Amino acid sequence: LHTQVGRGLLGAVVNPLGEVTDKFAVTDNSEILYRPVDNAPPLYSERAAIEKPFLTGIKVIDSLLTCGEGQRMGIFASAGCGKTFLMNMLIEHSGADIYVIGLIGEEGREVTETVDYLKNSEKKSRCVLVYATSDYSSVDRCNAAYIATAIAEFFRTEGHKVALFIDSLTRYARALRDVALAPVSVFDSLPRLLERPGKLKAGGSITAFYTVLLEADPLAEEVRSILDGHIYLSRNLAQKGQFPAIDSLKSISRVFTQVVDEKHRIMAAAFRELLSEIEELRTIIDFGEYKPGENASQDKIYNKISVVESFLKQDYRLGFTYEQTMELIGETIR
Template sequence: MTTQRSGHDQAAGEGDVHAAIASLRFAAKDVDTRAVRGRITRAIGTLLHAVLPGARVGELCLLQDHASGWSLEAEVIGLLPDGVLLTPIGDLVGLSHRAEVLPTGRMQEVSVGPDLLGRVIDSFGRPLDGKGPIKTVHKCPLRGKAPNPMRRRGIEQPFPLGVRVLDGLLTCGEGQRIGIYGDAGCGKSTLMSQIVKGAAADVTVVALIGERGREVREFIERHIGDALARTIVVVETSDRSAMERAQCAHMATALAEYFRDQGLQVVLMMDSLTRFSRAMREIGLAAGEPPTRRGFPPSVFALLPGLLERAGMGERGSITAFYTVLVEGDGTGDPIAEESRGILDGHIILSRALASREHFPAIDVLSSRSRVMDAVASGPHRKAASVFRDLLSRYNEAEFLIKVGEYKPGSDPLTDRAIDSIEELRAFLRQGQDEPSSFEETVSWMSRLTA
């Protein structure tokens, strides 16, 4: 009897709980709820201080002034004892003390899809080319993680670029990451154009970071041309905020990652890594970080590997990446040049002396290196490239003596051969912007020159 009563009491108790929950739900419908809102306490330069409980680093927030209708997105970049640091994604003109800060609860994402091919967009995926809206099919993180190093495929196959000096003497592999180092006026745009047009890629993603506005359309029309059909161009010009310029690099990399994950061969061309680093310097210094080498805060050197390691081989597809770096001379002492050389798989040095002689592409072959050439080039190919380099080096060593008339023919047979063949070597190294050369033709020509 006691057992029956206790079971009856338990059932009655459960019924009371369910009734109470239902009553609370009904009452909650009439409760006036408001989202968590913060307020701006300080705005100096490109940095905002705000009181915003519960905000997370990397979270997107919306700044709104209901009185004027002004609004702008911002990202949380730091936490303080009395609030948070935000960096605006756009122009702060119009901000007032009335503005509220609304956390969105989400990190930045990228809308991706095949309809992006042939389009020019900004770092938010908004079209800049006037061709109408873009249909996307998927979202992925703006700042993705690098692939697991143990699950990456190795770099085993050459990646033809259509540029003789690169295919022959600085052979790149599929999934390699290469830096292009040079000062302004060294033919950087010309070389980028040749790679975009000649590379054996399914998709090309070009990031133009901090470029002059007038140069963007010129680069697309003159240097990309018909290759735009399989290319996505991401643009943030020099007048945009530091966050937008920095985001341009992440946006382009995220797009390349999406197509790599579809099993495609992707070329990522970023111009330039220097301007990305300068944008991050602006953000870091505004946040109060201490300046170190050349005024760059420590966060820049922590962020570079994270960005560069996202490219390369994946489990299915690949991203073969080229990053331009603006340097003076050979780049000695430039912190971004030195840091990136230690991360990337090769470096291409552009020579102002060659460019001044109208020798394009103006690549200093003897100062440039591809770290994967030995793994992807055949034995005869490597041998021919070694002989070519040796001949070029011997001529450079004897060039001064030749010019002043002090060189004596017959003193060194190999140097004599280098002098006799220098014009043929230079003809191989020179290549017009619209003068494609297949990988097989390049290796065959180089083999004949060095036989």
């Protein structure tokens, strides 16, 4: 009900009891304070309107699904669509002040995969990991989300630009449903948990990414109406070699037009229509109706398939600045 916070947790691996059990980085600071894991969300008068972009360094996101500082973004995918690998990119290529990762419960060794990555990450001294594994009880798996959120909330109060990762909301809901078997329902602690991120007028911001495991869950329909948008990673795009396997046409950022300017909006609108006509031509090709020289309009969209796919794909080890992204999407568009 109370947990450790502070800069002394940077580089530490904390378990569902709030105790540091491992370290992926050692830092000068030893600041350790104590705050409750349950605290009230900011009143509407304390939240600032989302108006500044949270750049991720990922071309498809920053151009067509631009995030904002304080936004809550869902990541919907069926295992395995590289949802952990996209989060690694989001940590590695963004420019947040502090990253807080909460792994809700797994078998066990996947947690070590993340601590092994963090041990070799360039963001090691700006990261805190909270975990809960399948051995831990359903109450402990729930507390992992609140500890990760409370740790992120302290850094926001200090004025930091914080990025929070909860993986996953799916398995949090599993444990949360298990707790319900044991005015207030257990079930409705889910929306209160996701209401805490945001940019505060008197402090920093918490940009939160929640993962949802798919195989069209009822929970997916519940959470997608709560968040400020969602990123959909298509099974099919993954098997055809497109990484990140993000389907831009079924993903949205509801703060998109508040966080990008007008020439960006125009280029994104022109690119979305190009993508839609590309997908519409694919089905014509599979139907065996496409013949070169038949339709000059179809021929032009066909000759842009390669330039569009090259813009969409991205090496997981490479990040792009916003200027580079808008420069590349313009060459794809004209």
